[PDB]
Amino acid sequence: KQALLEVSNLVREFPAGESTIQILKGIDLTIYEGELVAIVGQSGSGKSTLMNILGCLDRPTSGSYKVNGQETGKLEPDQLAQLRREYFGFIFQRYHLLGDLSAEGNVEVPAVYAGVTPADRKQRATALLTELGLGTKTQNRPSQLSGGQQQRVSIARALMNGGDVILADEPTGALDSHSGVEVMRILRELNAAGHTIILVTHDMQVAKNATRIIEISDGEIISDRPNVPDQSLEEVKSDPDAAPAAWRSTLDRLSEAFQMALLSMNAHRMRTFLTMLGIIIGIASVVTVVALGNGSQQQILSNISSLGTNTITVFQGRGFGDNSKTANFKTLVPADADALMTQPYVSAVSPMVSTSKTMRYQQNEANATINGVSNDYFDVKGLVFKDGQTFDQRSVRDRSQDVVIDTNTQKQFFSDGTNPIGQVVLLGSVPARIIGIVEPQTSGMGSDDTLNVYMPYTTVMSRMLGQAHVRNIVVRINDKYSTSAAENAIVNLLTQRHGAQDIFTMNSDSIRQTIEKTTSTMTLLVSAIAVISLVVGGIGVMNIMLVSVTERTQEIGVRMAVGARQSDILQQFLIEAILVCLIGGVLGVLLSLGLGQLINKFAGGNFAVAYSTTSIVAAFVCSTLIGVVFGFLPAKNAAKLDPVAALSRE
Amino acid sequence: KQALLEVSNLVREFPAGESTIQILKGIDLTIYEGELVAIVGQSGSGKSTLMNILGCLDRPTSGSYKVNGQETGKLEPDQLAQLRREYFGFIFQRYHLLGDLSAEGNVEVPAVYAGVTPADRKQRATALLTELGLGTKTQNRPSQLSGGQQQRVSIARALMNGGDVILADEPTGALDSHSGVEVMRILRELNAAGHTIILVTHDMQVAKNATRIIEISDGEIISDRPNVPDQSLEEVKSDPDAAPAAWRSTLDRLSEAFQMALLSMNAHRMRTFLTMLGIIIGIASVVTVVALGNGSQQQILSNISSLGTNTITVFQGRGFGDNSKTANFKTLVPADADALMTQPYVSAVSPMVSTSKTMRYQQNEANATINGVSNDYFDVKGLVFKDGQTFDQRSVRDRSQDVVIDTNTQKQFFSDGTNPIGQVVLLGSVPARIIGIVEPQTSGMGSDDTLNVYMPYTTVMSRMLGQAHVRNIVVRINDKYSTSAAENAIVNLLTQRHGAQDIFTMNSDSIRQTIEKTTSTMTLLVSAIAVISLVVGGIGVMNIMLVSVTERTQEIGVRMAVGARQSDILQQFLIEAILVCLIGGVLGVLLSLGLGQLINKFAGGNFAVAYSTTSIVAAFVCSTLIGVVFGFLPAKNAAKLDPVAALSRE
């Protein structure tokens, strides 16, 4: 028949100085189930390398080691991990425990990396910890336990997956005489229950506890020989301790990884909040700058929407410097607008003049801008009437005091819901009857904020201003038929009619396009100086995750020796980085929101901030990608660690 | 007389569960110089607490401990540090060494904090390491040494400041039988030389190496008693080992802190380059943005530097057409300039007209801008003549073909060094003789470009263009009067002289002023989106330093135990952060430079980058301040650690 542990011709060469050295010189050994073995030797003998190979933490590399008939010489890390989970459990001199978890958690870890019900492993965990006398200390964390207590914890952990072969590296080397007697007694009782126990030690008095003492020096076994410890008379073995034993599952273990990362974040908070804080600052700056640019383009377009579509406007210079030069040198007259009206390219034309007067309705008064306009004006500027009607050509000609108001004026005087149409307000000293209401241009506030009122320009000029000239003339170019050449033919036409070239011309579509270009581009470059430099300046996640790997290299080694797959470590650290970046992106979004509603307070009427709902989705996605990226290299470096070198590193 | 170590009724309490517990009950001890003492007890007895107090790492809270007649009960941390450096040296179970330093360095550390010459301490370090058999291993790092070898290193370290009282925790607890005999024999040999040695242990077989065995349980000494070890005959001495005992020094401690921070940086490289890298990106982005803005303001001012200082320009005209229906409406005539000349506010006036023609000198062809101007023109635009003279009022009147050239045209045709004055080139079909050379408006060597040439405006209008009108008229404002009132009187004046308001005017000083305002504030905002978001988003230095304090807590404890002052730890980590920020702030400056010389290629004439030499100084200063700010909190957290808790944390 075949023994459990079958060692044939193990040669382990570790290279040193462009040459190889044999730490194991061709050892043959056979250990059957249930046997109590102490491998004893001095430092450099090869005892601990031999144990590493026995524990499937290392390969022969020349020879054969068969665990229950399975050769490990060619096996790959996850296969050796399988053998660890099924057959082996470990105990170390300094009794490595996870400072984050508790006793029950440390005990659970091996069950976690195997397939286990989270309820069931709580049952076995608390059960084993109770058998070993820690029942009251179940919830204690390693910093809260003594040396002996921690070593008993790691015993329970080794027994979680059944402890078929328990490998103890100098288990009493760290702790005192009493807890040493207890650890040794617990092991001997476990062997009495049938556990194969192999303890490696440099102390002969320690090796006395075994029934079989193998002695190793300079990579060869010099002695192996039966032994009966004398304390078997001391301990009659009264109180019995017997405790022997790609679709689907990656969901389950990935969930486990989520709680591993989550509780590890909860353990270390301050560092989570700082690394996360960089990303909060980053996403906040990104969304703040992008949304500020979007809202400022939107604002300055709706603020300049006072022009309209396909509208060429015609101005004058000053012509002042005296009040005689007013009636002299102001040459733009409504006759010019009438002339423009008969042109083939003009769909609509209006003159315009304005004055500020006190608008009174009943007891309420206010200050309003009164705009003398043609009845065509609402067509050219593109205003749509909420309720009423415009004037007529008849009413423009007859100097009607019919008046049109905008939504803001309705809000001012008629807040009662009383229909303003038909109501007679007074503008200055001139009464007016409201024939219509207009919904204005702007999206948000803007600069208006101002009460607009429209009367026929004839009535404003004659009844109010007392002037023969027009402030400016707006035209809607029909068909968009040579929209630029219309402006040119307009200046040619009025320059003929005037004595000289008296008139400035302003193209609305070109002004809008220029504003959109400049705002869009500068929002792009400023937002790049935010995004690229900041979020890319959030590499610190990578750095802190690298230092988190170097920190936990022992934790990683213990995880692997307890049966962690490389995939399991990688998923743990990727899920940690991903989760930190995701949550810190959510807080970056919220900081950007509240910060933006703060920036709406500031005096800029040109500055507004508009949050694109597809820049928020892009924010979450990009933050999570920062997690998956930086973010990656440490999560892979951890899973690629050598569990031997990882376990012994300090 | 009084013995070295005098303990009288020391009671050491710790709070447990909202109540106090006595770990040390009233203990009396007297240890004279030269005694070999083993304090032996089990875990919880109070033995290691008693040692901590003996080592001046902790205070009794009840009672007295006098080191050579000096009560430590009320002493402050730097005072206890003094006593450590003067009297004590330490040895720990796991033989704590600094993985960064070598054997010689670890041995030096106590001498380092004791104010010793690096030459002298190198001698004593190598001497002690040779005495203990490490002479060949002198340069090895702890990772390169065996357990016994490392413990021998820490022995030499304890002997550095003289090892009057050597306090050993379990010295053999980590290491095997042979190296145990070696370490323990070395101790007995040191006591033979007169070293007071106190070794605390949980193992009686270890305690028997001492001549005096004190035994302690539940905070009291149950036994104290002489002992003669049997190994005194087994150890015969063939090699007696006897090695017993203003403005200045703060600069020394800063030098040491600089050296060790530097070597620690050299130890961990990837961490350093990543931590820096954020600040390299940050400083690069700030200096790039500010220098881009300064250079773009520099260009957009030099692009509008085609105007003068205190220079009002007068334009007109848009549409094409006939000689009748267009040229009749061109009202700018040199007569307008003559009228302006007699005004009190006008220092100089020139009209201006331009045409592009092919300039030929000998075999060279080129294309030049030909500017009809008044002889006053160089006065108003502020051009200075490199060599020759301007025209005369007679030559302007007489349609002279005398011509003035700028530096660029000289560079083109006369690159032979041939004096251009007197030479006859031809402009188009019109020959001209050069009477003068002008140094242009350029700020920088990329602004100027095109070849300017100036003839009297009369000659250009009549001989070339065939037009009666002037493209525009430039006016320099005398008295340095109000340029706005100048515009007002100019527009009134030419508006009266013309039929109507025919003329547009540009104020040069106001345009320049506006460009400077908007560019400056704009770049301040964008550079704030760099700095505020980036360098402040470079908190990660603080985080890495903070976890670097965590990882080094044992290193910090050992340093304090060898005599480190809190100030010394503070200087170490604060100087580390400072150097991390400064180095890489310089690399951020260099990255910004190279990026700027990249942007000088790929960018147009509006984008240029000009690096202010007072923005680089500000870069170094600000980076170092980021060090002194963010690095501080960790550097303080390290210096405030309890050496007891720091040593036993893991």
Residue numbers in the entry:
A (entry chain B), B (entry chain A): 3 to 247, 260 to 664
Provide the publication's sentences verbatim.
MacB was purified and its crystal structure was solved at 3.4-Å resolution. A non-critical polypeptide segment between position 248 and 259 at the exterior of the NBD was found to be disordered. Two MacB monomers have a biological twofold rotation axis at the centre of the dimer. Each monomer in the dimer has essentially an identical structure (~1.1-Å RMSD in Cα position), and has elongated TMs (TM1 and TM2) protruding about 25 Å at the periplasmic side of the phospholipid bilayer. The interface between the monomers in the MacB dimer is extensive (2188.9 Å2) with major contributions from the TMDs (1053.0 Å2, 48%), PLDs (676.1 Å2, 31%) and NBDs (417.0 Å2, 19%). The TMD of MacB encompasses four TMs per monomer, which is the smallest number among currently characterized ABC exporters. Even though the MacB monomer has only one cytoplasmic loop, MacB preserves two CHs as observed in other ABC exporters. CH1 is present in the intracellular loop between TM2 and TM3, whereas CH2 is located in the carboxy terminus of MacB.
The envelope of Gram-negative pathogens, such as Acinetobacter baumannii and Pseudomonas aeruginosa, contains unique tripartite machineries that export noxious compounds from the cell. MacA-MacB-TolC contains similar components as the relatively well-characterized tripartite RND transporters AcrA-AcrB-TolC in E. coli and MexA-MexB-OprM in P. aeruginosa. However, the ABC protein MacB is unrelated to AcrB and MexB, which form large trimeric complexes in the plasma membrane, raising questions about the structure and domain organization of MacB in the tripartite efflux pump. Here, we present the crystal structure of MacB, and show that, by analogy to RND transporters, the MacB homodimer contains two large periplasmic domains (PLDs) that enable the interactions with the other components in this tripartite efflux pump.
